[PDB]
Structure formats: C-alpha cells, structure tokens
Amino acid sequence: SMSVKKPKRDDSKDLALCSMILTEMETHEDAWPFLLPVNLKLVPGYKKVIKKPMDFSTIREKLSSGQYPNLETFALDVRLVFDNCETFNEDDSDIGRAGHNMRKYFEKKWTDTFKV
Ligand SMILES: Cn1cc(C(=O)NCCN2CCCC2)ccc1=O
C-alpha cells in the first residue's frame, strides 16, 4: 500500500532475456507457420475468426520498439500466437502440431529463464 513497498524482482535483464527466447523461437524448425502474419487475403476465414492476430515478427517489432511494458505482456503475445493456432488448425495438421510443439518449447524456456 501507500509507502509500504513489497520487494520486487530485478527486472533489468528482462528485455535481453525475452529477446534471446524470441530468437530461439524464430530459429526453431517448427517456427515456419508463425514467422510472418497470416495472409488475410489468402487464408479464408482467418480475418473473421481470429480477432487478435499475432506472429513472431510482430512480437519482434514490438520488442525492438518498447511496446511491451513488462515481461508478462510479452508472454501474453507469445501465447496468443499458439492460442490462435489451436483455434484455427486441427491438432494433428502440420501447422497445428507445430503450434503445440512451439508452445511447449516456449513454456519450458520461460520457466527455465525466469522461475529461477
Ligand atoms: C499460423 N497459421 C499460418 C498459416 C500459413 O499459411 N502460414 C504461411 C506458411 N507459409 C507457407 C510456406 C511457408 C510459410 C495458415 C493458418 C495459421 O493458423
């Protein structure tokens, strides 16, 4: 409360650590469905069904331009990528399995990096 401060984790490395995680996502073999925005004029249904599209290159732009206030907002956009994937793709399609693979890959790095 007012003038009563909870001890706070050191957040000074967060930007560089989220950038390192994002780099490893971008270089993952199954990243290819997520590297660029889904082409709304070539993929039927995507615009109407998926209300908040998101991809690694948009995340990288937002990270390089100070559009994430904290690490939780960065993780929310990463998870949005995979939530959108599940909404639109069959679990066992190539794109759909890629999404499940990438989500697991991301959450481990997230726990390994920040749940010290
Ligand atoms: C995440 N997501 C991606 C697509 C897609 O077609 N991505 C472009 C794939 N390119 C084709 C070869 C190179 C990459 C469709 C639905 C979807 O949910």
UniProtKB/Swiss-Prot annotation:
Q: Domain Bromo spans what residues?
A: 9-113
- Which species is this UniProt entry from? Homo sapiens (Human)
Instruction: State which gene encodes it.
Output: BAZ2B
Localization annotation:
Nucleus
Q: What is this protein called?
A: Bromodomain adjacent to zinc finger domain protein 2B
Tissues expressing this chain: Expressed at varying levels in several tissues, whereas a smaller transcript was expressed specifically in testis.
The UniProt subunit note reads as follows: Component of the BRF-1 ISWI chromatin remodeling complex, at least composed of SMARCA1 and BAZ2B, which regulates the spacing of histone octamers on the DNA template to facilitate access to DNA. Within the BRF-1 ISWI chromatin remodeling complex interacts with SMARCA1; the interaction is direct. Component of the BRF-5 ISWI chromatin remodeling complex, at least composed of SMARCA5/SNF2H and BAZ2B, which regulates the spacing of histone octamers on the DNA template to facilitate access to DNA.
Question: Signal peptide span per the entry?
Answer: none
> Which family, according to UniProt?
Belongs to the WAL family.
Q: What does this protein do?
A: Regulatory subunit of the ATP-dependent BRF-1 and BRF-5 ISWI chromatin remodeling complexes, which form ordered nucleosome arrays on chromatin and facilitate access to DNA during DNA-templated processes such as DNA replication, transcription, and repair. Both complexes regulate the spacing of nucleosomes along the chromatin and have the ability to slide mononucleosomes to the center of a DNA template. The BRF-1 ISWI chromatin remodeling complex has a lower ATP hydrolysis rate than the BRF-5 ISWI chromatin remodeling complex.
